[PDB]
Amino acid sequence: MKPQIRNMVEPMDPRTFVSNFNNRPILSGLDTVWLCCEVKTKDPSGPPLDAKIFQGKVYPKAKYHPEMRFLRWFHKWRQLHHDQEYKVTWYVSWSPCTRCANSVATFLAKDPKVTLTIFVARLYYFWKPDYQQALRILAEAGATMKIMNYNEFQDCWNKFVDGRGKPFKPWNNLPKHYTLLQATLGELLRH
Amino acid sequence: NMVEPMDPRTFVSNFNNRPILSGLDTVWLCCEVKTKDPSGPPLDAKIFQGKVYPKAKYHPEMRFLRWFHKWRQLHHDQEYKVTWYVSWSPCTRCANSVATFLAKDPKVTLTIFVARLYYFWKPDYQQALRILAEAGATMKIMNYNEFQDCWNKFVDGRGKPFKPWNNLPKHYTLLQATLGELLRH
Ligand SMILES: [Zn+2]
Ligand SMILES: [Zn+2]
């Protein structure tokens, strides 16, 4: 009898959630793309203000990348709400392209009342220069980036997936993939 | 450089650098000894194999140590540059033994090139690399050039060029970053 984030969204299939990662090597193709976001105030102790899921089958074109959809939605949301300081969390399934990173950064500059934390499930094209730069572009703008570990997948399952009481069911390579991807992110950001 | 070379298919299958790999129970170690002289030709060169299963004494790192001891008697006290090309990174028990060795004998500098990190997600095996690095061993992930040198020197490729498998540089990037992360601070 308390306000849950699950009630504030249209939750995704378990299948839409895990099909990209479950028993699939880091260097794979994709079935879906998603971005689960959460909005809070300065105080992390507070209750979650609002949340939304941007999902779709893979390879939308630039304009409909979940990151851009988020920016359109959150630009209006900021206007239809009290002005204070907000902290935004993303759980996003794929790597930001350069075009999304630039639009997000410019946003972060015009609206310093907002800080952004990004959890990425899997890096892609991390060997391509533009994708590496996109990560640095976001860090430069003050966005915080981390790879999703068990807790984050678990949390994202609890808040955003149609789980039906059922618990998060981790795949075997999840911590292995995490270590590899977290080290690679770290590397791309420093160098 | 007369080694008893390994078979092409043994190479391609054991030095494949997918980070997460099953069905490779064998560690392969190709080694080269030189004088600290950067010009000095290969003194000797050997190939050791060992199942990664129980006896850590039958790991190719251990076998190398004994061989290198007898070898270091048959010949003269001088400065040695050892290089390794190994298919899995050292288990924690071999790390200790190799560390100890390098400590006692300071006129030998070891450089370990690694195709894959063994249990990189496990804290105990992460410590192994830290131990080796403390003892002065240079740790590096094998990239194209190292796979190619290992091919030329240790494989029976009948003149044919080293040919890269799918995703060699992509796997490299993952592994090298991971190694760097594990040796930070
Ligand atoms: Zn994009
Ligand atoms: Zn061992």
- This structure's resolution (Å) is 2.4
Residue B158 in 3-state DSSP?
coil
Contact (Cβ atoms closer than 8 angstroms) between residue A88 and residue A38 = yes
Report d(CA B145, CA B95) in Å as an integer: 25
Burial string for B24-62 (b: 16+ CB within 10 Å, else e) reads beebbbbbbbbeeeeeeeeebbbbbbbebeeebeebbbb
Report chain breaks in chain A, C–N > 2.5 Å, as residues after which they occur: none
Residue A191 carries which side chain, given as an amino acid letter?
H
φ/ψ (deg, to 5) at A31: -100, -45
For residue A62, give the ligand nearest its CA: 1
For CA atoms A117, A93, A135, A148, give the dihedral sign.
positive
- For B77, the enclosing helix (H) or strand (E) is none
Q: How are strands ordered across the β-sheet holding B138-141?
A: B44-51, B26-35, B80-88, B108-116, B138-141
For CA atoms A13, A17, A19, A22, give the dihedral sign.
negative
Contact (Cβ atoms closer than 8 angstroms) between residue A100 and residue A63 = no
* HEC profile of chain A: CCCCHHHHCCCECHHHHHCCCCCCCCCCCCCEEEEEEEEEECCCCCCCCEEEEEEEECCCCHHHCHHHHHHHHHHHHHHCCCCCCEEEEEEECCCCCHHHHHHHHHHHHHCCCEEEEEEECCCCCCCCHHHHHHHHHHHHCCCEEEECCHHHHHHHHHHHECCCCCCCCCCCCHHHHHHHHHHHHHHHHHC
CA-to-CA dists, residue A128 to A21, A132, B75, angstroms: 21, 6, 50
Cα-based angle B10, B11, B14 (whole degrees, multiple of 5): 80
Report d(CA B47, CA B32) in Å as an integer: 9
CB atoms within 10 A of CB B164: 11
Contact (Cβ atoms closer than 8 angstroms) between residue A95 and residue A125 = yes
Nearest to B53 by CA among B18, B80, B91, B100: B91
Contact (Cβ atoms closer than 8 angstroms) between residue A93 and residue A20 = yes
- Compute the distance from residue A103 Cα to the ligand 1 centre, in Å: 9
Contact (Cβ atoms closer than 8 angstroms) between residue B124 and residue B117 = no
Q: Which residue of B has its CA nearest to A182?
A: B178
> Do strands A86-92 and B108-116 pair parallel, antiparallel, or not at all (unpaired)?
unpaired
Q: Quick one: A41 exposed, middle or buried, by C-beta within 10 A (0-12, 13-18, 19+)? A: middle
CA A2 distance to own-chain centroid: 25
Q: Quick one: B106 exposed, middle or buried, by C-beta within 10 A (0-12, 13-18, 19+)? A: exposed
Report d(CA A191, CA A182) in Å as an integer: 14
Chain A, chain B: beta-carbon pairs less than 8 Å apart: 47
> Do strands A114-120 and A144-147 pair parallel, antiparallel, or not at all (unpaired)?
parallel
φ/ψ (deg, to 5) at B72: -80, 0
> Do strands B138-141 and B108-116 pair parallel, antiparallel, or not at all (unpaired)?
parallel
What approach was used to elucidate this structure? X-ray
Contact (Cβ atoms closer than 8 angstroms) between residue B136 and residue B101 = no
Distance from the Cα of A127 to chain B's closest Cα (Å) equals: 7
A positions 16-45 inside 8 Å of B (CB) = 25-27
Contact (Cβ atoms closer than 8 angstroms) between residue A183 and residue B180 = yes
Q: Which residue of A has its CA nearest to B166?
A: A27
Give yes or no for A189 touching B (CB within 8 A). Answer: no
Nearest to A183 by CA among A60, A26, A51, A66: A26
Report d(CA B110, CA B135) in Å as an integer: 10
Contact (Cβ atoms closer than 8 angstroms) between residue A179 and residue B178 = yes
- Compute the distance from residue B56 Cα to the ligand 2 centre, in Å: 5
The set of residues, in sequence order, having a beta carbon less than 8 Å from that of B118 and lying 6+ positions away, is B52, B88, B89, B90, B91, B125
- For B75, the enclosing helix (H) or strand (E) is none
Q: Quick one: B132 exposed, middle or buried, by C-beta within 10 A (0-12, 13-18, 19+)? A: buried
Residue A41 carries which side chain, given as an amino acid letter?
T
Residue B4 in 3-state DSSP?
coil
Residue B122 in 3-state DSSP?
coil
> Do strands B44-51 and B26-35 pair parallel, antiparallel, or not at all (unpaired)?
antiparallel
For residue B89, give the ligand nearest its CA: 2
DSSP string, B18-55: -SS--S--EEEEEEEEEES-SSPPP-EEEEEEEESSS-
